[PDB]
Design a protein around this ligand. Structure first.
Ligand SMILES: C[S@@+](CC[C@H](N)C(=O)[O-])C[C@H]1O[C@@H](n2cnc3c(N)ncnc32)[C@H](O)[C@@H]1O
Ligand SMILES: [Mg+2]
Ligand SMILES: [Mg+2]
Ligand SMILES: [Mg+2]
Ligand SMILES: [Mg+2]
Ligand SMILES: [Mg+2]
Ligand SMILES: [Mg+2]
Ligand SMILES: [Mg+2]
Ligand SMILES: [Mg+2]
Ligand SMILES: [Mg+2]
Ligand SMILES: [Mg+2]
Ligand SMILES: [Mg+2]
Ligand SMILES: [Mg+2]
Ligand SMILES: [Mg+2]
Ligand SMILES: [Mg+2]
Ligand SMILES: [Mg+2]
Ligand SMILES: [Mg+2]
Ligand SMILES: [Mg+2]
Ligand SMILES: [Mg+2]
Ligand SMILES: [Mg+2]
Ligand SMILES: [Mg+2]
Ligand SMILES: [Mg+2]
Ligand SMILES: [Mg+2]
Ligand SMILES: [Mg+2]
Ligand SMILES: [Mg+2]
Ligand SMILES: [Mg+2]
Ligand SMILES: [Mg+2]
Ligand SMILES: [Mg+2]
Ligand SMILES: [Mg+2]
Ligand SMILES: [Mg+2]
Ligand SMILES: [Mg+2]
Ligand SMILES: [Mg+2]
Ligand SMILES: [Mg+2]
Ligand SMILES: [Mg+2]
Ligand SMILES: [Mg+2]
Ligand SMILES: [Mg+2]
Ligand SMILES: [Mg+2]
Ligand SMILES: [Mg+2]
Ligand SMILES: [Mg+2]
Ligand SMILES: [Mg+2]
Ligand SMILES: [Mg+2]
Ligand SMILES: [Mg+2]
Ligand SMILES: [Mg+2]
Ligand SMILES: [Mg+2]
Ligand SMILES: [Mg+2]
Ligand SMILES: [Mg+2]
Ligand SMILES: [Mg+2]
Ligand SMILES: [Mg+2]
Ligand SMILES: [Mg+2]
Ligand SMILES: [Mg+2]
Ligand SMILES: [Mg+2]
Lengths: 85, 238, 95, 335
RNA sequence: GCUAAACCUAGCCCCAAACCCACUCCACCUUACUACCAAACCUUAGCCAAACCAUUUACCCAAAUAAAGUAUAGGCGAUAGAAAUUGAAACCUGGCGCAAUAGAUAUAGUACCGCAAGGGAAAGAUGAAAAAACCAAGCAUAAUAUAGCAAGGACUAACCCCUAUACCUUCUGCAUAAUGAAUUAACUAGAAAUAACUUUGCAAGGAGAGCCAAAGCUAAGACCCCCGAAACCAGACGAGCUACCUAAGAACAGCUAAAAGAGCACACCCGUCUAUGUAGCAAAAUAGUGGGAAGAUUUAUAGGUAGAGGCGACAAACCUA
RNA sequence: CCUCCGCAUAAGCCUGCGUCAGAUACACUGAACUGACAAUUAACAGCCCAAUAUCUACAAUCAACCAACAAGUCAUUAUUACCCUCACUGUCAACCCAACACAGGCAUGCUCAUAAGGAAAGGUUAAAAAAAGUAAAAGGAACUCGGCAAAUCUUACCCCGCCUGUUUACCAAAAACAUCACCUCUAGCAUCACCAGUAUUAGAGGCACCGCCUGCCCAGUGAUCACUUGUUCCUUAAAUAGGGACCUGUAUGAAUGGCUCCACGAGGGUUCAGCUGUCUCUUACUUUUAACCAGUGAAAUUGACCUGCCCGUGAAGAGGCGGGCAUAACACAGCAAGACGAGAAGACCCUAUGGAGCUUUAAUUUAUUAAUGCAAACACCUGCAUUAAAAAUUUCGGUUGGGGCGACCUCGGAGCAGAACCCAACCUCCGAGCAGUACAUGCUAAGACUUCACCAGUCAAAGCGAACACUCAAUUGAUCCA
């Protein structure tokens, strides 16, 4: 949520502007939990998953401030408990 | 707001159902449609627009007897109570439909085109080309939506390959599958258009509120002026 | 100008004055002639020379500029190679 | 502008010229609104021979040269060369340049404008007057002949006479424009009679007109402006005064030409008739109008003429030969 | 001599310090204070300044100071504005604060006003014990006697005589014009800098780090008002009046009529014209006369539509005078 | 003597004229004021109901004829489950909404004039003016803007609007709006409006019943048909002008304009006859008011006043100033000539770099919506761009009666300061927004002038370098920014 100048010039009108991410429903498999989940993701998180080498690695490695998902934290707790027990 | 639609009935019945007037308002409570409010109280009679509806534990063509042909407040056309087996239902009456008349509903498409009697409902495939039809469905087993106003008749123009071109009363052609069912003939209450309201009071009874007193300049806009043409406007006579 | 800042509660300098004028420590202000870069093709060499000058300001102008600048701009500066170094002090001035 | 001045000109012309010209008016109307055909008058002080060859390459023909040939099947002003394209050709001359000598090769101007100059039968060593010289064109053509011993250029507006100075400098060398050789004045032309009488062999009078061609196109300082409506009304009166003033300055036996740019018989025929009447009564001087039937006949090839004028000759614009309107009347002072 | 006047202390203000509140029982989200049944996160805008306005126009964010109103930013205008770096001493129970028109609005968020959100007062004074003098205005004591801004010069003597065009403020200037004042008491309106000047201290140095300095530096003294719009924006509160609608209701005598958004005409609804009334009975009424009075009628109850909006048989109508 | 009110219910209010005892907007030492005490008793009314399926075409109108249209206000069954009873709450009044014990507002039943409920006159007198009535000789609209009011109860028209209806609550009830009928535009469709609808429909609009007139840019002649023409291609460098195809499944045109006409109207105008105090021309009586007596007791207003007349002065205008004149002092009742009489609310003109509503072809936008294209993604969503709709923010310079059409705003010259400089607004005239010649139209520097400020603008000795700081009255534009 921000402002913009009309034609990229400060002398023009200032307008409210909202940039929204592109959303996709995708299916992911957790081998730690042995379950498939349908989740709303962006391309960023798909790239993050790819570089982490899997969803499980992505969830476990990524701290809370980067994940920015309650479900992500719940997944993390699930996986940590599986590994602990 | 606190608006709840009166259309709550889940089970079909021939009993007139108490209906609530909207006044042209929404669920929100604001007006969406002007010139609606407060006519004579009305009761809704549920209409089975699916003419080929075989009874429970029954299939194939069935026949019905017309019990009565009756005025309906909710629509321009007359309605008919029709009985078959142990079921009574309301349907849209044709131009020439009387009490004691027997009407047939079939799903049978004939290789040889069957003779089209006024009361009967047939698939468009069965019906000959050029027959006046009514109560048509866009999709097979959807239900009648298209020719159901008083004295309205569609024409089956042509039948190609499992498809049929019909002429809607607005002279617009429509593509329909041959399996779709239509009722033969013209709808009841011909010369409904010929009726004379006579006084302002009658429209008020029909639930039509008077038009706004505000004067509007024109229904259509003014043509937008292109860049070189402006000098050609506003010429003053001398 | 801002007599008292909201943040510090201090007098503020008008930055327009700094962009256009030089203060000599003796109290004089130096300026360029207006329109010295403008339409030189239509101007006489004498006029062009008059325009390409660094000129002093009125008493009234100096007083205005003093008020529009803080004390920082009025301090003695010992710049390493200052072209206006000699002009900072007045000599043989009687009243 | 809330109401264009050019629209008033159209309204004014339609009501008066339609009845004046009849079926001819449509043809004139379309020609007036269309683009003006131009003639190139070669500067004699420049390389006349080289320019003539150059313009001949552009498939332009010297009409006046052809006119001189058919003249002898008085004499016209010599040393005048104007190239114009053939009938039905829309070709434009390239913009003029300075020459080797430092004077411009040719002047682009209305060919019909030369006819008053040609009508005036200029002879060597003639003292000549132009009451309304500015902005130029005609007065330039006077100098081109080289028959002018003393030329006087006059115009009420010093703004327009300044433009003449620029034209004179560009085209005519300083040698030719010596002391009293070419005299330029910014004084009133009406009071010219009392200034000097019986001075000039030949006088060219080009009164202010409605400027039919110019009024239809150019909005700025239009005569048909409501602010200038009073000027239009007093214009027929003013025209007579100037023509009379020119006649006073003329020596007896001398010839004047009255040139007007308008189609209006009010500003063409009645002015000439009025001037004669005024001069015959007030000053008791007789003027004889010289017939230009021979003159019109010679120039039929290039210019179409309106053959209904009692006095003078009116050149009407045609879409074939889009030359601006020119009414020239030649007359001699008997006494 | 009446009305009155007078009073000192309830309490409050700013600090400092210290991190606050929270069940007798019973009742209380339904119409709160009623024993007992099938769903929150979401850029503030605008006034204002720029002498218009349209980009822009300080507003806490982790504790002094100094760097510094510097670098920077900005219709490079109005104005906005850092950081690196430096560096911070710790004793609560005090007051050159107010004393009933002050100090809290407060004796109290009460009375009262408003449908609601909301607005919001006033005032008390004995003495150790109540089981003990005079003074504002207004008047009265005590009405008045030719003549005149109300007085002054006077005079034996109040008046008589002579002299004298109320006060404030405004308009280019003028008052006598216009503005403001019934009168009394209380309350009610000039806030700060640079630079200069004056008086000290020290002096090529001054200053209790920073800053200035070609007699300057340090310190002190000494200059910058009050009341008033129509507006604009944000968040609430309003359809118990009224506009329209929804749900389920009610009312309409009598007479003529082939029988009706018919006629006469009650009740009922409205408000044509006149008169009365005009601080009224009434912030729109009364009396007469009128228009309609089975209907596009009138009306009770409950519900709905909300201001960048609603609603409208468009009158810019109505949306709590 | 009045009753256009009453009694009850609903709604609202909440102890608000019961008893006892006290002090004390006419008053009773009594009040509805203060304190204490007492009271409205359920049958009326409120407060209801086990579940799951399932049933319910046929108004009402004395419901019978007859006639409809706007199509309507009340119905169950099958199976399971089920045994305890009369609880709780409203019940008063002279009452509510209007700041009041307010000529107002206020639903229903019964009474349609009362069986119920009330009192217009504090006492007097009989002035004026004012208000409401009654009666009036002779005349009968002569009154007046107008038959307004009153009396009498009336005809024939004209204009406007078809009509009933609606509108500015609180100055406009109308010719305005709506309205049947007609016409135009838009839409081929389901589960929250339109609509449980479907082109004889629905929405957005125009006009205003009916009735009568008003209707072609469909390709031209010639004898449905040939042929140039219109439209598209190709040849042609490309054209001119030639080669080929089509115009033959149909078209109607006006949200166009006029014209009478029946009924109707608190519409605007005219008129017949009567009629009446409207008037000639006013009078008499009654009531209210009034004035006086007794009680209670406001408001606007007020610089102070010991508050006269005539003439003059103050650009008009004086109670108060000047010159004359007048003049014991005090009530009460009339009056409206003056006190630019008093209170708001106006209307007119002007001003503000003060607002707001409306409109657009004002400027700045497209944040929003809709569509499109390109990316992403494998139709939706997201990002970017474009196009429209819908709005949003902001403004509307100065001179010229005021308004329309015009003119003007900067610089130079003249009338124009007779003679240093400056200075004649407004007006009456003229002109300027260049141009030409150099190409040292290079550099630098004493001293000066100056359009009354500033900013700008002007002249110039000497010197360096060259050579042997141009003409012209104006001929012009700061900062920022690029
Ligand atoms: C139509 S122009 C002449 C055309 C010109 N000779 C040409 O050919 O281009 C007339 C001129 O006469 C001038 N003029 C008008 N009145 C005048 C008078 N009284 N005395 C002199 N010249 C006058 C006008 O100002 C104008 O420039
Ligand atoms: Mg319906
Ligand atoms: Mg309308
Ligand atoms: Mg501002
Ligand atoms: Mg207090
Ligand atoms: Mg207080
Ligand atoms: Mg006293
Ligand atoms: Mg005296
Ligand atoms: Mg006053
Ligand atoms: Mg409501
Ligand atoms: Mg309501
Ligand atoms: Mg209803
Ligand atoms: Mg009746
Ligand atoms: Mg009726
Ligand atoms: Mg009636
Ligand atoms: Mg209404
Ligand atoms: Mg209107
Ligand atoms: Mg209006
Ligand atoms: Mg209000
Ligand atoms: Mg009591
Ligand atoms: Mg009971
Ligand atoms: Mg009684
Ligand atoms: Mg009484
Ligand atoms: Mg009395
Ligand atoms: Mg009387
Ligand atoms: Mg009488
Ligand atoms: Mg009369
Ligand atoms: Mg009469
Ligand atoms: Mg009279
Ligand atoms: Mg009357
Ligand atoms: Mg009488
Ligand atoms: Mg009507
Ligand atoms: Mg009616
Ligand atoms: Mg009516
Ligand atoms: Mg009304
Ligand atoms: Mg009104
Ligand atoms: Mg009215
Ligand atoms: Mg109308
Ligand atoms: Mg009426
Ligand atoms: Mg009295
Ligand atoms: Mg009394
Ligand atoms: Mg008072
Ligand atoms: Mg007087
Ligand atoms: Mg006097
Ligand atoms: Mg009196
Ligand atoms: Mg006075
Ligand atoms: Mg403004
Ligand atoms: Mg503003
Ligand atoms: Mg000066
Ligand atoms: Mg001046
Ligand atoms: Mg020299």
């Amino acid at each position: 949520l921000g402002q913009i100048y009309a034609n990229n010039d400060k002398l023009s009108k200032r307008l409210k502007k909202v940039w929204k991410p592109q959303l996709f429903e995708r299916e992911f498999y957790s081998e730690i939990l042995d379950k498939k989940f349908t989740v709303t993701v962006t391309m960023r998180t798909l790239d993050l998953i790819d570089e982490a080498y899997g969803l499980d690695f992505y969830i476990l490695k990524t701290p809370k401030e980067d994940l920015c998902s309650k479900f992500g934290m719940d997944l993390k707790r699930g996986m940590l408990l599986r590994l602990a027990r | 707001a606190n608006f709840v639609s009166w259309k709550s009935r889940t089970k079909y019945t021939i009993t007139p159902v108490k209906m609530r007037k909207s006044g042209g308002r929404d669920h929100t409570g604001r007006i969406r449609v002007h010139g609606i409010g407060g006519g004579h109280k009305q009761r809704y009679r549920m209409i089975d627009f699916l003419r080929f509806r075989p009874e429970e534990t029954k299939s194939g063509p069935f026949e019905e007897k017309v019990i009565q042909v009756r005025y309906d407040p909710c629509r321009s056309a007359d309605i008919a109570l029709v009985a078959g087996g142990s079921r009574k239902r309301w349907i849209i009456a044709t131009e020439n439909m009387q009490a004691g008349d027997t009407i047939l509903n079939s799903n049978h498409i004939g290789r040889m085109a069957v003779a089209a009697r006024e009361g009967d409902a047939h698939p468009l495939g069965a019906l000959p080309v050029g027959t006046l039809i009514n109560n048509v469905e866009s999709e097979p087993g959807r239900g009648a939506q298209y020719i159901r106003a008083a004295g309205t008749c569609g024409v089956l123009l042509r039948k190609v390959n499992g498809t049929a071109i019909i002429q809607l009363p607005s002279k617009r052609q429509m593509q329909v599958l041959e399996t779709c069912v239509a009722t033969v003939g013209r709808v009841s209450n011909v010369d409904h258009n010929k009726r004379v309201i006579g006084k302002a009071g009658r429209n008020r009874w029909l639930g039509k509120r008077p038009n706004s007193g505000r004067w509007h300049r024109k229904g259509g806009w003014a043509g937008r002026k292109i860049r070189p043409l402006p000098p050609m406007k506003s010429y003053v006579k001398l | 100008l801002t007599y008292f800042s909201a943040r510090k509660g201090k007098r503020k300098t008008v930055k327009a004055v700094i962009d256009r004028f030089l203060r000599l420590h003796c109290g004089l202000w130096v300026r360029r002639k207006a329109g010295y870069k403008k339409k030189l093709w239509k101007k006489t060499p004498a006029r062009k020379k008059r325009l390409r000058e660094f000129v002093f300001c009125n008493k009234t102008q100096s007083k205005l500029l003093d008020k529009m600048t803080t004390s920082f701009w009025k301090r003695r500066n010992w710049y390493v190679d200052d072209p206006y170094q000699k002009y900072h002090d007045r000599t043989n001035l009687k009243v | 502008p809330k109401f264009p001045a050019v629209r008033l000109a159209l309204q004014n012309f339609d009501m008066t010229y339609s009845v004046q010209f009849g079926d001819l008016w449509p043809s004139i109307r379309v020609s007036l609104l269309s683009e003006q055909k131009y003639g190139a008058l070669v500067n004699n002080f420049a390389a006349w021979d080289h320019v003539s060859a150059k313009l001949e390459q552009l498939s332009a023909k010297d009409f006046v040269n052809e006119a001189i040939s058919h003249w002898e099947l008085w004499a016209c002003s010599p040393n005048l060369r104007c190239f114009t394209f053939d009938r039905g050709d829309i070709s434009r001359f390239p913009p003029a340049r300075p020459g080797s000598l430092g004077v411009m090769e040719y002047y682009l101007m209305d060919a019909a404008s030369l006819l008053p100059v040609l009508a005036l039968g200029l002879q060597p060593g003639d003292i000549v007057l132009d009451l309304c010289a500015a902005p130029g064109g005609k007065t330039l053509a006077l100098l081109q002949t080289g028959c002018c011993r003393n030329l006087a250029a006059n115009d009420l507006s010093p703004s327009r006479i300044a433009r003449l100075q620029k034209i004179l400098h560009s085209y005519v060398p300083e040698e030719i424009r010596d002391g009293n050789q070419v005299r330029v004045t910014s004084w009133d032309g009406r009071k010219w009679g009392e200034l000097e009488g019986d001075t000039y062999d030949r006088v060219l009078v080009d009164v202010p007109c409605t400027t039919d061609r110019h009024s239809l196109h150019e909005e700025e300082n239009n005569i048909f402006k409501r602010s200038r409506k009073k000027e239009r009304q007093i214009l027929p009166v003013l025209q007579v005064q100037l023509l009379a003033a020119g006649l006073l300055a003329t020596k007896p036996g001398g010839h004047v030409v009255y040139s007007t740019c308008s189609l209006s018989h009010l500003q063409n025929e009645y002015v000439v008739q009025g001037a004669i009447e005024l001069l015959a009564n007030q000053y008791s001087i007789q003027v004889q109008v010289e017939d230009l039937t021979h003159f019109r006949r010679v120039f039929m090839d290039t210019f179409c003429f309106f053959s209904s004028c009692q006095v003078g000759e009116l050149v009407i614009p045609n879409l074939m030969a889009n030359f601006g309107p020119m009414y020239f009347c030649k007359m001699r002072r008997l006494t």
